């Protein structure tokens, strides 16, 4: 299963 | 800012007239990802052409593999023609069967 973004640029 | 595509044309098997084969047009190293790829038989668009999905390499440059079924004959000319915002005109690479 893939990765999830949590932290923004 | 913009990366010009590299285009390679080749078959899955050494050609034999009258024997089914696969023709590939492998288009790499380009940016941005919008691109237009056609494969041609005697200068006419080949109607059924499989394309991989938009994805990219280690170095971030995009690539697509277009391939289609074909049965080569002695006289048929085969090409891949690529339209990309990096180039003023489409770029056409002919299958070299004798490589």
């Amino acid at each position: 299963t893939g990765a999830a973004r949590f932290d923004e640029f | 800012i913009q990366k010009t595509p590299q285009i390679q044309v080749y078959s899955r098997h050494p050609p034999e007239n009258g024997k089914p084969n696969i023709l590939n047009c492998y288009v790499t190293q380009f940016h941005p990802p919008h691109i237009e790829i056609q494969m041609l038989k005697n200068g006419k668009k080949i109607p059924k052409v499989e394309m991989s999905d938009m994805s990219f390499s280690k170095d971030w440059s995009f690539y697509i593999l277009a391939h289609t079924e074909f049965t080569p004959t002695e006289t048929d000319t085969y090409a891949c023609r690529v339209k990309h915002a990096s180039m003023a005109e489409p770029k056409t690479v002919y299958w070299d069967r004798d490589m």
Binding site: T1, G2, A3, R5 | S52, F56, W60
Partner: protein
């Protein structure tokens, strides 16, 4: 070694709606899942028979993760116009690749979590999986935030745990395709050159996986210096091909040998013209 990698792309197209958002999943550089926001039904989809076995729970979980991701990418594309002082009128690209390389025994070799903006490096998690490389002043802003947030620690947990464990699963449910060893079949072509010389090109066709060693030899030593080749490339059927050429004099073809090594050959192949 085997890899699980997710190649994510968001392309903005101002005035033609929201950024195009795509995810593509690969086991060992063959595609097995995709999500495209331009699909009629934007959903994580199978791209190999072996992943279909997974439960409804799997597809709905992945679909929601992609949707969440699409949102984050929209926000990040907006942040980038600010950091680089760019017009909200132009098309831009963010790319993200994340995943794991695992040894045959199943211990992690290398994790990746990295981003590029407009085709240029933005920020990338080092091999220590603790440290960020920020290519420019824009990315330093991000790196400061991520260091404070413990981002690396969370990304590392995904790279070491989830990624490795799912890969191990994928390799087994998919083993018929993913663990196969299609051997190379090789031949040599001969082209006379205008200079009086001969090009010998050694072709390797039909092989899987991609890894191969192809060389030319004369009297037991390699011709690594004057060898032309092409990078290994897909042949339209899930196999790969490559060639390597050397220039040789007119009678002396027979004294030059092409060498091929691959997991699917018990013994290296040796061919001549």
């Amino acid at each position: 070694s085997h890899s699980l990698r997710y190649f994510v792309t968001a392309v903005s197209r101002p005035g033609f709606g929201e950024p195009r958002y795509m995810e593509v999943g690969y086991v060992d550089n063959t595609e097995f899942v995709r999500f495209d926001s331009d699909a009629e039904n934007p959903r994580y989809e199978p791209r190999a028979r072996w992943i279909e076995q997974e439960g409804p729970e799997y597809w709905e979980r992945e679909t929601r993760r992609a949707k969440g991701n699409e949102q984050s990418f929209r926000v990040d594309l907006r942040t980038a116009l600010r950091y680089y002082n760019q017009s909200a009128g132009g098309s831009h690209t963010l790319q993200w690749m994340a995943g794991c390389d695992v040894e045959s025994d199943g211990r992690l070799l290398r994790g990746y979590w990295q981003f590029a903006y407009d085709g240029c490096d933005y920020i990338a998690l080092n091999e220590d999986l603790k440290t960020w490389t920020a290519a420019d002043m824009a990315a330093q802003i991000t790196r400061r935030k991520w260091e404070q947030a413990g981002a690396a620690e969370r990304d590392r947990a995904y790279l070491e745990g989830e990624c490795v464990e799912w890969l191990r699963r994928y390799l087994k449910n998919g083993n018929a395709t993913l663990l196969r060893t299609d051997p190379p079949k090789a031949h040599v072509t001969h082209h006379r050159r205008p200079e009086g010389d001969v090009t010998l090109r050694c072709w390797a066709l039909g092989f899987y996986p991609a890894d191969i060693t192809l060389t030319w030899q004369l009297n037991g030593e390699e011709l690594t210096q004057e060898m032309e080749l092409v990078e290994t490339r897909p042949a339209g059927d899930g196999t790969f091909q490559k060639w390597a050429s050397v220039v040789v004099p007119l009678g002396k073809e027979q004294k030059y040998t092409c060498h091929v090594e691959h997991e699917g050959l018990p013994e290296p192949l040796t061919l001549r013209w």
